[PDB]
């Protein structure tokens, strides 16, 4: 039957979520709206990518410069700025992915109902919107909900990881630090930035300590962990891929070889597909294209003892998250 | 006596230009304006840099929410967006440096004048302003022209070179190409670029080529070389510095040495400090912080015959160019 | 049906391997390399950075010097001196000298001792006969056992020029190649007794490097001799390079006239060698483009019907690693 | 009292200790010897430095072949591929800075004595030699110990830190996660690295998780903290300056304010020159050329609870360290 959704904002996640859509069985992209991208550009954008190569799984021919015959199936293209104006219904979009980045408030992201959107999943943290992390609290969802936050490229990594170690060894207190690549919010040269004074520096030639909320966020998905965790971040000159680094003082004495078998049996378990397991000398690039939320590098980690350890978990901020986007609509539609 | 000027736009060129003035003893920066860099976020800027080392020539402290105080010599800051609405006259801007990559049109830049600024010098080739290149036509200036443009990071490099070869050889044609560094005009990751598609791709991950009017933009500074030139560019992952690839064909059959001797004996006194000469297995970074408008790589360059050669000229697009501003303005005030 | 062997398992060496395994033309049987173990190989060949991970078909170790690329096994050597690799004892007829230390007709002929019929050097050779694909693979008889497939750059600039030359005739020109860093560039300001510049930071500078790929053109295309030559700039990128060829032609022709001349050339007689693309693409846009040259329509600029700048791309690694296999396909059909 | 030094590893770390010596009003560089780099080539690498700026202090000319001539003072050159025959004293050098990183074994670096060498500082941990981290345990050097090791770019950071913290609050335990800038031990493109597989991956375009006993090393200069520390590393794409993401668990419940004032107070005290204290919104590069062994980033760190905090202190590996090297000599002699 396929869940008809509307991608609003054609950014990175914005089309990666697209790319992951037009290549499925249970979902179908029928319209995208980003006023800053003409259709004649919207194709080119979608077609070519520095990180995920050339499309070619359907052909791309513009039908009537406002459509976009995405090889057989059609996909309406809009340039409506205000979310209350975009006419989703008329085109046909039950669910609307929120990949524009400037409407995280449950309201500014709710303006999508008007147009006609039935359900709208905010593809970014939310100051007041139900945060659902696949494999952790996406279970705790109810129909009546119409506005959900799919957490952050990170969180979907830290949470599954935390739910693993915790359900097994209970996290006492723990600091996390993630070596993130650079996104569309960093300059290329020291420029102006009223929010992240530091992030307003050349992103390709420095290390920048951009603060996070991901862990203070895990307090949402996992309640018990609320307060036990926090952390930060380090932006770096890498294009894609990123990596968590949770250091926790578990409350159930166990060795590293035991915590590793844990994630593993958890990666082959219910969490199979969300949290991955890997025991091989790898490097950022080798995860470019990983459809998993969190990858566990059992060799990168280190343990000082059975009560204090440091765990490293890889994760494609772009690809993995973009899968977490559709995968949720897949859940919000089976409910 | 000590020309007082102000910069509109504290971008890379702003702070950098200031660094040339607040350093210089024949010019005195008096007022600045960047509607995006509130005073606070200004000190942290003007001081710490990622390409030209930290600032250590005069203490940087804020006297109040409306006036900095570099090296115990106050300077003012406005949060004004619209040019004209900036009280340039109040500080004492006998001159104003328009560096925002936007307001680069006679009328646009002509705004300032309203606030007071007796003169405005655009820092980017203008459509209706008379561009000049210190070391070529900076005499075609007159005290009757208020708005003027100061060539571009490149024009200031090709100009003086094509100058010395036309002044000593005979330019029939000759194409250019520039392996030019990034800029705050490009995106970090594949991003929408309204007018410059190629430019909307990952900055420090691609060999993004692009056109450069500077080519036959030098057909204005040196009216003699009309059409006799033209070229393009290649933006490569480099924070600063850039090089010129001039494949010129000449008439007066000359040997690569009869050139070096010229380009040197032309840097030894005619365009000394406005053009340099080096014969060393150098690289881009070696040129960081070079006030010369255009360095010549007496080695990297090649010759097919005494009539068809390739010449290479290194330049710190950022730093160097700047000194052309506070030299042009310096000169501009003498006439 | 054509068995081969590679000495030195570098990028080209591995990618030239990735070809023979996914091809139905050539088959990989030998792999000599003293600096990497059988156990280490099954990792330097698997997960890659520029060309991604190799999931195409399962890999597995059998028992040292033995390796399973799916179900087809490959002998793995560690001998250091070429003349001591028993190629003949594994089945490798053609020994691909993709190591970059043996480029002398004499030196790389050490395989010929190991019982290998012919050796294909994967780079310029001061004396061994050079043949660039699409240019003059015809100038090769079944009697030369020490050949060369020119360079990552010459395999690109070669066609592009010939195509222009045949149609509009070349009088004199020059070239530049904003090329990507390679195995012979230090990670940080280090030594290099031959290329000082080439020593400094690899991805933090723009290293100007000597290059006679244009000078080499002269050898694979007689009438173009002495009328070419250029330089190169080693900028901060992992792969793909570009050819900046500013040149004069005898038959004054509009830029479009070249475009179609070019475009029509890359549509029949040279299809799979040269390419023609008219879109705003970049470096990463060409990772894996098995072509030798790839003209960029909207890229180069013309100064008039008698002095234009033709620019073309070419994945130094893949485009080349592919042409090596293509020059073994030719020698295999003479 | 001029301490005559001798270098045996002219590399990123070798040239620097030379620069530091030529400016050290009390040290004397009299012999360099990285066999591969010659008297001609040597000048180049010493003069130009892609990172730490071009050398402008001295003048440096070449008096004959076998010897340089840095500003009036001659320095005997060496191209001896083996330590058992480098005539250190024959040229005059009580101390021999071992900067090859291929002779870290006491007996392997003792091949210097057999040439007329007295003390020999190995700028790299030794499996057997003694470790000293200036500001920490430089107390335990005894006139007799001829061969000594100088911790590491990394340890020479985590020690000043872990100390100023343990002294003031006592570390219960803790993990370190450093982000180092690629070095010569890497390859530019996926190449062989049999002793560190990951390492040989594209150094300029990846996130390679390395290992470093730097944290387990402090248990050698800090006897108490033995087995209380540990940690691995991440080599993101940069050139210089790094960070110590230290996660600890302190004894005396002390608020973050206090941990800042603890580092600071002692940063100006008995550790002046070793620890630093930045309370600004800085980034990577700003730390370039900072001789401190470990600058504390007051604003980067974050605390979960008054016992489990995360302190972050930057250190310019290459340069910062280099000094400590000399410093140990200024100390190894004065006793």
């Amino acid at each position: 039957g396929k869940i008809k959704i509307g991608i609003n904002g054609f950014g990175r996640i914005g089309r990666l979520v697209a790319r992951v859509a037009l290549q499925s069985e249970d979902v179908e992209l029928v319209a995208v709206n980003d006023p800053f991208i003409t259709t004649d550009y919207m194709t080119y954008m979608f077609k070519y990518d520095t990180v995920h190569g050339q499309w070619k799984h359907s052909d791309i021919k513009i039908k009537d410069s406002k459509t976009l015959l995405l090889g057989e199936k059609p996909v309406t293209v809009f340039g409506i700025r205000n979310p209350d104006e975009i006419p989703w219904a008329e085109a046909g979009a039950e669910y609307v992915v929120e990949s524009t980045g400037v409407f995280t408030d449950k309201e500014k992201a709710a303006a999508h109902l008007k147009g006609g959107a039935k359900k709208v999943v905010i593809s970014a943290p939310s100051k007041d919107a139900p945060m659902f992390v696949c494999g952790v609290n996406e279970d705790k969802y109810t129909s009546d909900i119409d506005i959900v936050s799919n957490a952050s490229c990170t969180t979907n990594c830290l949470a599954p990881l935390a739910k693993v170690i915790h359900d097994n060894f209970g996290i006492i207190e723990g600091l996390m630090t993630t070596v993130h690549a650079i996104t569309a919010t960093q300059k290329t040269v020291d420029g102006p930035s009223s929010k992240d004074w530091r992030g307003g520096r050349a992103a390709s030639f420095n290390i920048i300590p951009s603060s996070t909320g991901a862990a203070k966020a895990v307090g949402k998905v996992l309640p018990d962990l609320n307060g036990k965790l926090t952390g930060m971040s380090f932006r770096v000159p890498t294009v894609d891929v990123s990596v968590v680094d949770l250091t926790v003082r578990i409350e159930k004495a166990a060795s590293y070889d035991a915590i590793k078998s844990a994630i593993k049996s958890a990666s082959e378990g219910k969490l199979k597909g969300i949290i991955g397991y890997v025991e091989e000398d790898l490097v950022s690039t080798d995860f470019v294209g990983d459809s998993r939320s969190s990858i566990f590098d059992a060799k990168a980690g280190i343990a000082l003892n059975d009560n204090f350890v440091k765990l490293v978990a890889w994760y494609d901020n772009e690809w993995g998250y973009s899968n977490r986007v559709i995968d949720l609509i897949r859940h919000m539609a089976k409910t």
Side-chain angles (χ1 to χ4, degrees), chain A:
Chain A
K2 290 190 171 178
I3 315 160
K4 288 181 168 59
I5 86 300
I7 307 300
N8 186 305
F10 222 53
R12 230 59 165 62
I13 275 73
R15 76 254 199 189
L16 293 182
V17 160
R19 281 195 169 194
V20 177
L22 49 158
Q23 183 55 49
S24 67
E25 306 282 359
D26 20 59
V27 54
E28 174 210 8
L29 178 34
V30 295
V32 302
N33 166 52
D34 187 279
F36 295 63
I37 306 165
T38 134
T39 309
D40 54 67
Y41 186 46
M42 207 170 288
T43 85
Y44 164 80
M45 288 238 97
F46 177 97
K47 185 191 184 187
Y48 295 30
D49 212 282
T50 302
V51 176
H52 309 276
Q54 186 177 2
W55 180 233
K56 272 55 280 178
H57 288 56
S58 66
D59 179 65
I60 320 71
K61 39 184 290 182
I62 317 80
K63 260 199 68 183
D64 77 76
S65 57
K66 264 177 66 182
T67 296
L68 201 69
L69 166 50
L70 228 308
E72 286 147 348
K73 281 177 185 168
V75 181
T76 303
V77 169
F78 299 128
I80 313 128
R81 293 210 261 57
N82 286 187
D84 189 343
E85 304 202 65
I86 314 158
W88 295 111
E90 289 305 293
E94 181 167 39
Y95 297 67
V96 180
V97 188
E98 292 300 27
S99 50
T100 96
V102 279
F103 302 106
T104 59
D105 305 310
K106 178 194 174 186
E107 316 304 1
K108 294 167 193 176
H112 278 261
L113 286 305
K114 296 80 169 186
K118 228 73 178 180
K119 295 295 205 62
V120 171
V121 179
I122 313 169
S123 79
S126 282
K127 58 122 195 179
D128 69 3
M131 285 169 67
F132 284 118
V133 174
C134 306
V136 180
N137 78 298
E138 96 283 358
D139 261 343
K140 302 292 180 175
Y141 168 68
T142 55
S143 308
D144 45 0
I145 299 301
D146 288 302
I147 307 165
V148 303
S149 176
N150 186 42
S152 59
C153 64
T154 292
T155 317
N156 274 292
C157 175
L158 185 74
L161 185 52
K163 182 180 180 59
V164 175
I165 299 63
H166 192 59
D167 289 325
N168 276 299
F169 318 138
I171 302 164
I172 292 163
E173 79 202 319
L175 275 164
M176 162 290 268
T177 309
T178 171
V179 177
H180 214 296
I182 57 3
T183 73
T185 43
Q186 255 151 295
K187 315 298 179 188
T188 61
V189 300
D190 302 311
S193 184
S194 302
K195 270 287 154 291
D196 208 346
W197 267 37
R198 317 205 206 46
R201 306 295 291 289
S204 315
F205 314 149
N206 306 64
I207 328 163
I208 326 163
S210 292
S211 278
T212 182
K216 187 174 183 167
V218 172
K220 291 293 218 64
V221 294
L222 277 313
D224 346 61
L225 298 173
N226 165 208
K228 296 165 182 168
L229 306 181
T230 174
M232 63 159 99
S233 161
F234 277 117
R235 312 299 287 192
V236 291
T238 66
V239 31
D240 200 356
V241 162
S242 315
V243 51
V244 162
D245 193 24
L246 173 81
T247 302
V248 295
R249 267 174 60 281
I250 33 162
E251 78 171 72
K252 284 190 189 300
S255 80
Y256 194 48
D257 297 305
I259 308 0
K260 293 151 69 173
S261 171
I263 286 201
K264 178 174 159 56
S265 299
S267 64
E268 307 183 306
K270 60 164 69 179
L271 297 176
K272 184 177 183 184
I274 288 73
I275 174 164
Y277 190 63
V278 184
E279 294 198 44
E280 292 191 307
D281 299 321
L282 299 174
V283 287
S284 72
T285 353
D286 293 311
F287 291 170
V288 171
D290 231 70
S291 53
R292 281 97 76 64
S293 295
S294 171
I295 292 73
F296 182 36
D297 193 327
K299 302 190 70 174
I302 174 72
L304 177 47
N305 55 55
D306 322 312
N307 296 290
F308 185 44
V309 66
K310 171 179 298 301
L311 296 172
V312 186
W314 286 91
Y315 72 89
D316 182 323
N317 56 295
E318 308 189 320
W319 202 235
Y321 181 50
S322 300
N323 287 294
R324 291 304 94 64
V325 180
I326 287 77
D327 281 55
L328 196 97
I329 283 73
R330 280 172 162 162
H331 180 300
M332 299 186 59
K334 288 192 185 69
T335 299

PDB file of all heavy atoms in Angstrom, chain A residues 254-267:
ATOM      1  N   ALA A 254      31.715  -6.357  35.524  1.00  0.00           N
ATOM      2  CA  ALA A 254      31.879  -7.244  34.374  1.00  0.00           C
ATOM      3  C   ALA A 254      33.070  -6.785  33.528  1.00  0.00           C
ATOM      4  O   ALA A 254      33.443  -5.611  33.545  1.00  0.00           O
ATOM      5  CB  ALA A 254      30.613  -7.262  33.541  1.00  0.00           C
ATOM      6  N   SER A 255      33.672  -7.715  32.794  1.00  0.00           N
ATOM      7  CA  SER A 255      34.828  -7.382  31.971  1.00  0.00           C
ATOM      8  C   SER A 255      34.425  -6.864  30.604  1.00  0.00           C
ATOM      9  O   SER A 255      33.240  -6.815  30.261  1.00  0.00           O
ATOM     10  CB  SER A 255      35.744  -8.600  31.789  1.00  0.00           C
ATOM     11  OG  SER A 255      35.263  -9.476  30.783  1.00  0.00           O
ATOM     12  N   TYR A 256      35.433  -6.484  29.828  1.00  0.00           N
ATOM     13  CA  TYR A 256      35.233  -5.956  28.494  1.00  0.00           C
ATOM     14  C   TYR A 256      34.691  -7.037  27.568  1.00  0.00           C
ATOM     15  O   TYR A 256      33.767  -6.799  26.794  1.00  0.00           O
ATOM     16  CB  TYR A 256      36.555  -5.418  27.960  1.00  0.00           C
ATOM     17  CG  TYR A 256      36.394  -4.555  26.741  1.00  0.00           C
ATOM     18  CD1 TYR A 256      35.437  -3.545  26.712  1.00  0.00           C
ATOM     19  CD2 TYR A 256      37.196  -4.738  25.616  1.00  0.00           C
ATOM     20  CE1 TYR A 256      35.280  -2.736  25.598  1.00  0.00           C
ATOM     21  CE2 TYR A 256      37.048  -3.932  24.492  1.00  0.00           C
ATOM     22  CZ  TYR A 256      36.083  -2.933  24.493  1.00  0.00           C
ATOM     23  OH  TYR A 256      35.912  -2.132  23.391  1.00  0.00           O
ATOM     24  N   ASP A 257      35.263  -8.233  27.664  1.00  0.00           N
ATOM     25  CA  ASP A 257      34.847  -9.359  26.833  1.00  0.00           C
ATOM     26  C   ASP A 257      33.390  -9.712  27.091  1.00  0.00           C
ATOM     27  O   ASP A 257      32.769 -10.389  26.285  1.00  0.00           O
ATOM     28  CB  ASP A 257      35.731 -10.593  27.101  1.00  0.00           C
ATOM     29  CG  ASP A 257      37.208 -10.371  26.729  1.00  0.00           C
ATOM     30  OD1 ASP A 257      37.499  -9.997  25.571  1.00  0.00           O
ATOM     31  OD2 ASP A 257      38.084 -10.586  27.597  1.00  0.00           O
ATOM     32  N   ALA A 258      32.849  -9.248  28.214  1.00  0.00           N
ATOM     33  CA  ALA A 258      31.459  -9.529  28.572  1.00  0.00           C
ATOM     34  C   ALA A 258      30.527  -8.436  28.070  1.00  0.00           C
ATOM     35  O   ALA A 258      29.372  -8.687  27.733  1.00  0.00           O
ATOM     36  CB  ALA A 258      31.324  -9.671  30.090  1.00  0.00           C
ATOM     37  N   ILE A 259      31.037  -7.216  28.030  1.00  0.00           N
ATOM     38  CA  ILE A 259      30.251  -6.094  27.565  1.00  0.00           C
ATOM     39  C   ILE A 259      30.180  -6.174  26.052  1.00  0.00           C
ATOM     40  O   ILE A 259      29.211  -5.743  25.447  1.00  0.00           O
ATOM     41  CB  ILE A 259      30.903  -4.770  27.970  1.00  0.00           C
ATOM     42  CG1 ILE A 259      31.188  -4.783  29.474  1.00  0.00           C
ATOM     43  CG2 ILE A 259      29.995  -3.612  27.604  1.00  0.00           C
ATOM     44  CD1 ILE A 259      30.837  -5.979  30.396  1.00  0.00           C
ATOM     45  N   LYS A 260      31.217  -6.734  25.444  1.00  0.00           N
ATOM     46  CA  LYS A 260      31.268  -6.870  23.995  1.00  0.00           C
ATOM     47  C   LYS A 260      30.264  -7.914  23.544  1.00  0.00           C
ATOM     48  O   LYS A 260      29.486  -7.685  22.622  1.00  0.00           O
ATOM     49  CB  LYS A 260      32.683  -7.262  23.559  1.00  0.00           C
ATOM     50  CG  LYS A 260      33.707  -6.164  23.797  1.00  0.00           C
ATOM     51  CD  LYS A 260      35.105  -6.706  24.038  1.00  0.00           C
ATOM     52  CE  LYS A 260      35.716  -7.324  22.800  1.00  0.00           C
ATOM     53  NZ  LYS A 260      37.142  -7.686  23.050  1.00  0.00           N
ATOM     54  N   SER A 261      30.275  -9.067  24.198  1.00  0.00           N
ATOM     55  CA  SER A 261      29.338 -10.117  23.848  1.00  0.00           C
ATOM     56  C   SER A 261      27.924  -9.599  24.057  1.00  0.00           C
ATOM     57  O   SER A 261      26.983 -10.075  23.435  1.00  0.00           O
ATOM     58  CB  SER A 261      29.561 -11.348  24.719  1.00  0.00           C
ATOM     59  OG  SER A 261      28.522 -12.292  24.522  1.00  0.00           O
ATOM     60  N   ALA A 262      27.778  -8.619  24.940  1.00  0.00           N
ATOM     61  CA  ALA A 262      26.469  -8.045  25.222  1.00  0.00           C
ATOM     62  C   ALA A 262      25.908  -7.337  23.993  1.00  0.00           C
ATOM     63  O   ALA A 262      24.874  -7.737  23.465  1.00  0.00           O
ATOM     64  CB  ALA A 262      26.568  -7.074  26.388  1.00  0.00           C
ATOM     65  N   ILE A 263      26.583  -6.282  23.546  1.00  0.00           N
ATOM     66  CA  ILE A 263      26.132  -5.545  22.371  1.00  0.00           C
ATOM     67  C   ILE A 263      25.871  -6.546  21.263  1.00  0.00           C
ATOM     68  O   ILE A 263      24.813  -6.536  20.642  1.00  0.00           O
ATOM     69  CB  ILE A 263      27.197  -4.537  21.841  1.00  0.00           C
ATOM     70  CG1 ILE A 263      27.308  -3.317  22.757  1.00  0.00           C
ATOM     71  CG2 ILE A 263      26.821  -4.074  20.443  1.00  0.00           C
ATOM     72  CD1 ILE A 263      27.895  -2.018  22.244  1.00  0.00           C
ATOM     73  N   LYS A 264      26.854  -7.414  21.029  1.00  0.00           N
ATOM     74  CA  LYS A 264      26.770  -8.429  19.984  1.00  0.00           C
ATOM     75  C   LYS A 264      25.450  -9.190  20.032  1.00  0.00           C
ATOM     76  O   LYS A 264      24.627  -9.072  19.125  1.00  0.00           O
ATOM     77  CB  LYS A 264      27.954  -9.394  20.100  1.00  0.00           C
ATOM     78  CG  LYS A 264      27.942 -10.533  19.092  1.00  0.00           C
ATOM     79  CD  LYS A 264      29.219 -11.359  19.189  1.00  0.00           C
ATOM     80  CE  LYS A 264      29.046 -12.754  18.594  1.00  0.00           C
ATOM     81  NZ  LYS A 264      28.578 -12.712  17.189  1.00  0.00           N
ATOM     82  N   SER A 265      25.242  -9.963  21.092  1.00  0.00           N
ATOM     83  CA  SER A 265      24.010 -10.726  21.236  1.00  0.00           C
ATOM     84  C   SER A 265      22.811  -9.788  21.141  1.00  0.00           C
ATOM     85  O   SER A 265      21.684 -10.225  20.924  1.00  0.00           O
ATOM     86  CB  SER A 265      24.004 -11.463  22.575  1.00  0.00           C
ATOM     87  OG  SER A 265      25.089 -12.375  22.662  1.00  0.00           O
ATOM     88  N   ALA A 266      23.066  -8.493  21.300  1.00  0.00           N
ATOM     89  CA  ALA A 266      22.016  -7.483  21.223  1.00  0.00           C
ATOM     90  C   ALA A 266      21.902  -6.983  19.789  1.00  0.00           C
ATOM     91  O   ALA A 266      20.867  -6.457  19.382  1.00  0.00           O
ATOM     92  CB  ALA A 266      22.333  -6.318  22.160  1.00  0.00           C
ATOM     93  N   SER A 267      22.983  -7.153  19.032  1.00  0.00           N
ATOM     94  CA  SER A 267      23.033  -6.737  17.638  1.00  0.00           C
ATOM     95  C   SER A 267      22.456  -7.851  16.781  1.00  0.00           C
ATOM     96  O   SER A 267      22.078  -7.633  15.633  1.00  0.00           O
ATOM     97  CB  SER A 267      24.476  -6.464  17.217  1.00  0.00           C
ATOM     98  OG  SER A 267      25.252  -7.646  17.272  1.00  0.00           O
TER      99      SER A 267
END
